[PDB]
């Protein structure tokens, strides 16, 4: 789901999209723990998880 994930990212803000790029290793190839990602954003593991959930839900519909 490289194209579909991309269409989803287009609907998120810069910040949310980059959370997901980091998470899924879309740029450097390496997936990252919710904790690495949370540290990069200065937010909790849970907030990163909610962003990921929002994206998966968007990924399912269209």
């Amino acid at each position: 789901m490289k194209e579909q994930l991309e269409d989803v990212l287009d609907t998120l803000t810069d910040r949310e999209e980059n959370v997901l790029r980091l998470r899924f290793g879309l740029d450097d190839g390496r997936t990252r723990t919710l904790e690495e990602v949370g540290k990069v954003f200065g937010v909790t593991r849970e907030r990163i998880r909610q962003i990921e959930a929002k994206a998966l839900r968007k990924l399912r519909h269209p």
Partner: protein
Amino acid sequence: MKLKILDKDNATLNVFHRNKEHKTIDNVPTANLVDWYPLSNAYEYKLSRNGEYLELKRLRSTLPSSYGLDDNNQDIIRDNNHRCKIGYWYNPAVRKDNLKIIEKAKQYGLPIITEEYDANTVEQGFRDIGVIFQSLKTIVVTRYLEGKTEEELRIFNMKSEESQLNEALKESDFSVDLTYSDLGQIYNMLLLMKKISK
């Protein structure tokens, strides 16, 4: 705040304005992003009350302060050297901090947005920053394991590499925080470069 790079030369920017309303600004120049676009993950732009300016807003984050805005104080937010007049695409505060970030990236052997680059060199930059992240994750657990040197290391060591890394990161020093902040802004820069060079 959503910046879309349409091609090497042209972007659009969509920002919250008021109520439920967003505004989309077209003909956004890609050339100068360093001078305006905040690289910090703790901030984003909103449209000013009158539509002439893009004004900074602090998100809810533990990341360091940038652009002289510690939290949302409209003395600084509304001030001319802290915002970006639309179509002028210059924000002195943002530019100043962006530039520190740039010099740091240059020091780490990463390509930078103010000098020439192409897709290959950006890709190499993402390779190298990935290496930095990984090494960092090794150092973080190393340092946590010293602290925190109790013979209960066995308890920690009952976890997987990921749970260990997670607990160490959770509990780390402010210094480590600063390293991750820096790297996050550099990552944002490399992504702007990737997108421009597509």
